[PDB]
Design an enzyme around this catalytic site. Structure first.
Site, PDB file in Angstrom:
ATOM      1  N   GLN A 114      48.098  43.360  35.804  1.00 13.55           N
ATOM      2  CA  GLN A 114      47.082  42.986  34.340  1.00 13.55           C
ATOM      3  C   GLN A 114      45.721  43.963  34.042  1.00 13.55           C
ATOM      4  O   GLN A 114      45.249  43.568  33.343  1.00 13.55           O
ATOM      5  CB  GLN A 114      46.148  42.238  35.725  1.00 13.55           C
ATOM      6  CG  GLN A 114      45.533  42.373  36.718  1.00 13.55           C
ATOM      7  CD  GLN A 114      44.578  41.977  37.556  1.00 13.55           C
ATOM      8  OE1 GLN A 114      44.786  40.750  38.053  1.00 13.55           O
ATOM      9  NE2 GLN A 114      43.375  42.616  38.062  1.00 13.55           N
ATOM     10  N   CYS A 119      43.281  37.741  35.933  1.00  9.90           N
ATOM     11  CA  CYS A 119      44.943  37.552  36.992  1.00  9.90           C
ATOM     12  C   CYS A 119      44.970  35.866  37.205  1.00  9.90           C
ATOM     13  O   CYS A 119      46.100  35.379  37.296  1.00  9.90           O
ATOM     14  CB  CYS A 119      44.010  37.185  38.862  1.00  9.90           C
ATOM     15  SG  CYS A 119      42.128  36.512  39.054  1.00  9.90           S
ATOM     16  N   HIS A 151      40.346  35.938  44.146  1.00  6.38           N
ATOM     17  CA  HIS A 151      41.652  36.176  43.225  1.00  6.38           C
ATOM     18  C   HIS A 151      42.432  35.320  42.631  1.00  6.38           C
ATOM     19  O   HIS A 151      42.768  34.424  43.809  1.00  6.38           O
ATOM     20  CB  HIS A 151      42.140  37.395  43.906  1.00  6.38           C
ATOM     21  CG  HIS A 151      43.381  38.295  43.435  1.00  6.38           C
ATOM     22  ND1 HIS A 151      43.021  39.018  42.109  1.00  6.38           N
ATOM     23  CD2 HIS A 151      44.842  38.623  43.965  1.00  6.38           C
ATOM     24  CE1 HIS A 151      44.527  39.775  41.751  1.00  6.38           C
ATOM     25  NE2 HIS A 151      44.974  39.206  42.473  1.00  6.38           N
ATOM     26  N   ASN A 166      51.954  39.268  42.741  1.00  2.77           N
ATOM     27  CA  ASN A 166      50.203  39.284  42.536  1.00  2.77           C
ATOM     28  C   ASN A 166      50.373  40.186  41.234  1.00  2.77           C
ATOM     29  O   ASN A 166      51.756  39.922  40.831  1.00  2.77           O
ATOM     30  CB  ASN A 166      49.916  40.220  43.118  1.00  2.77           C
ATOM     31  CG  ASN A 166      48.212  41.142  43.888  1.00  2.77           C
ATOM     32  OD1 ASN A 166      47.369  40.218  42.514  1.00  2.77           O
ATOM     33  ND2 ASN A 166      47.689  41.424  44.497  1.00  2.77           N
TER      34      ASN A 166
HETATM   35  C1  HVW Z   1      41.470  37.938  38.538  1.00  2.10           C
HETATM   36  C2  HVW Z   1      41.618  39.424  38.446  1.00  2.10           C
HETATM   37  C3  HVW Z   1      40.020  37.621  39.107  1.00  2.10           C
HETATM   38  N1  HVW Z   1      39.141  36.440  39.659  1.00  2.10           N
HETATM   39  C4  HVW Z   1      39.228  35.025  38.883  1.00  2.10           C
HETATM   40  O1  HVW Z   1      39.121  34.971  37.433  1.00  2.10           O
HETATM   41  C5  HVW Z   1      38.919  34.079  39.451  1.00  2.10           C
HETATM   42  C6  HVW Z   1      40.116  33.424  40.003  1.00  2.10           C
HETATM   43  C7  HVW Z   1      39.967  32.005  40.853  1.00  2.10           C
HETATM   44  C8  HVW Z   1      39.280  32.598  42.260  1.00  2.10           C
HETATM   45  C9  HVW Z   1      41.350  31.140  40.726  1.00  2.10           C
HETATM   46  N2  HVW Z   1      37.598  33.186  39.191  1.00  2.10           N
HETATM   47  C10 HVW Z   1      36.930  33.502  39.348  1.00  2.10           C
HETATM   48  C11 HVW Z   1      35.951  32.988  37.956  1.00  2.10           C
HETATM   49  C12 HVW Z   1      35.210  33.846  37.067  1.00  2.10           C
HETATM   50  C13 HVW Z   1      34.491  33.334  36.498  1.00  2.10           C
HETATM   51  C14 HVW Z   1      34.800  32.006  35.358  1.00  2.10           C
HETATM   52  C15 HVW Z   1      34.158  31.242  34.074  1.00  2.10           C
HETATM   53  C16 HVW Z   1      34.430  29.995  33.599  1.00  2.10           C
HETATM   54  C17 HVW Z   1      33.981  29.972  32.763  1.00  2.10           C
HETATM   55  C18 HVW Z   1      32.940  30.573  31.798  1.00  2.10           C
HETATM   56  S1  HVW Z   1      32.455  30.047  30.533  1.00  2.10           S
HETATM   57  C19 HVW Z   1      31.941  28.387  30.643  1.00  2.10           C
HETATM   58  O2  HVW Z   1      30.881  30.242  30.528  1.00  2.10           O
HETATM   59  O3  HVW Z   1      32.950  30.034  29.784  1.00  2.10           O
HETATM   60  C20 HVW Z   1      32.194  31.436  32.457  1.00  2.10           C
HETATM   61  C21 HVW Z   1      32.819  32.207  33.432  1.00  2.10           C
HETATM   62  C22 HVW Z   1      35.696  31.678  36.507  1.00  2.10           C
HETATM   63  C23 HVW Z   1      35.986  31.892  37.290  1.00  2.10           C
HETATM   64  C24 HVW Z   1      36.187  33.260  40.572  1.00  2.10           C
HETATM   65  F1  HVW Z   1      34.066  34.104  40.185  1.00  2.10           F
HETATM   66  F2  HVW Z   1      36.251  34.078  41.281  1.00  2.10           F
HETATM   67  F3  HVW Z   1      35.177  32.007  40.596  1.00  2.10           F
END
Ligand code: HVW
Ligand code: HVW
Ligand code: CA
Ligand code: CL
Ligand code: CL
Lengths: 215, 215
Positions: B19, B25, B162, B182
């Site tokens: 990535q 991820c 993640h 991964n």
């Molecule tokens: C991977 C390298 C990073 N991790 C993630 O993306 C993680 C994965 C989950 C645990 C399956 N999700 C993160 C996450 C961060 C930000 C957002 C998010 C979604 C939408 C918006 S918006 C509506 O304002 O456009 C902002 C931010 C979702 C998920 C985590 F923080 F871990 F949750």
């Protein structure tokens, strides 16, 4: 689009509600927008169930928070949402008790407004009806808002943390605004409403996460 | 469900990706689950585009993070996801450049695994194929993993951060595990893979936000 629009005058907006101690703003914002489209399509204004969304939208976190898009997607997949009368608001997440018998509205998808474009959000409100929006309601000034066109230099256009409903737009004492319905009860702000600054560089991030449901 | 399964041996898993400096991820995880179902439906294994997701899944935040369900919903609403060759990975978010001519797979929805249920994750991996899962990958031990079955008590199952891909399960010297792919390149862990503890009280929260697409 017209210079001013106010859907409260057209009977598309229900009374202001109070989410209480649950972080269910996203559910009230989503139901507001669905109520507006149901009035447009059928002629009838009805309270729909935010509790139904709080307990059943597994993509969101209930009272812990969530997004309106996930709620529209659940109503679409679920093939319906109950009326408030069939699934009352309690203020705490409980198990999913959706009752098909009480379904009062459906959703065929949603549309999003182009990110950060207030001209596009204005056209959408005028063409569609009330639209769900997200904003930074974090500042203490917002919390103790009272009357007037709210504007604060501090507002972070990218710390979106609250969901509300844009039910119109206009101008007051020279200042262009958005008419926003909150879910903090009628004792907050101007009987539960707040006029937020419009065309003032996307103040509070009002046009960053705006959507509305399809019917 | 069988005692052991490994989709790498059946030709259902593409090579390990990297990535880069973009928090996509979720996109790699989503595309890996879609790749597995595509192989099962058409008999063809090919690389799908994570970049198409980063740039086009407006419910997520691009390189800032996102969820896998949003991704499967976008592929459903959009009537398709592109191949990698038709939409290459660049590692930074850019505007949507989805091309219908390059469509390589479709999606008719998704299914979520019940929260914390390892037996259900186990059955899904066996009968459906690879499953997207979320975990706590924040500890140094996870970063430095090389061989054996990963297990750590300070992994917080309530701190999901993640997204990876469960491509099988089995047992190694009496330690049951999950075979995980991964998106940190072919040098991290064991050629890009980590064996994570299975049936050890939902270690790393492996079964807390798992889901797969329907095709
Ligand atoms: C991977 C390298 C990073 N991790 C993630 O993306 C993680 C994965 C989950 C645990 C399956 N999700 C993160 C996450 C961060 C930000 C957002 C998010 C979604 C939408 C918006 S918006 C509506 O304002 O456009 C902002 C931010 C979702 C998920 C985590 F923080 F871990 F949750
Ligand atoms: C309303 C009183 C509270 N504010 C919000 O709910 C807010 C509304 C946005 C900005 C329109 N969203 C918050 C939020 C909190 C938690 C989550 C969430 C979603 C999914 C999951 S999951 C996949 O693990 O079940 C966990 C948590 C989303 C959004 C905000 F933090 F502001 F983003
Ligand atoms: Ca969603
Ligand atoms: Cl204007
Ligand atoms: Cl077992």
């Amino acid at each position: 689009a017209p210079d001013s629009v106010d859907y409260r005058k057209k009977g598309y907006v229900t009374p202001v509600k109070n989410q209480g101690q649950c972080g269910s703003c996203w559910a009230f914002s989503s139901v507001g927008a669905l109520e507006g489209q149901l009035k447009k399509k059928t002629g009838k204004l009805l309270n729909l169930s935010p509790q139904n969304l709080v307990d059943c939208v597994s993509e969101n976190d209930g009272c812990g928070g969530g997004y309106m898009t996930n709620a529209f997607q659940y109503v679409q997949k679920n093939r319906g949402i109950d009326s408030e009368d069939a699934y009352p608001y309690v203020g705490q997440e409980e198990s999913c008790m959706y009752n098909p018998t009480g379904k009062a509205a459906k959703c065929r998808g949603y549309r999003e407004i182009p990110e950060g474009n207030e001209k596009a959000l204005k056209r959408a409100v005028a063409r569609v009806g009330p639209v769900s929006v997200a904003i930074d309601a974090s500042l203490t000034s917002f919390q103790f808002y009272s009357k007037g066109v709210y504007y604060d230099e501090s507002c972070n256009s990218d710390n979106l943390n609250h969901a509300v409903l844009a039910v119109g737009y206009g101008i007051q004492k020279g200042n262009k605004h958005w008419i926003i319905k909150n879910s903090w009860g009628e004792n907050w702000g101007n009987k539960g409403y707040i006029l937020m600054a419009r065309n003032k560089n996307n103040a509070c991030g009002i046009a960053n996460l705006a959507s509305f449901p399809k019917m």
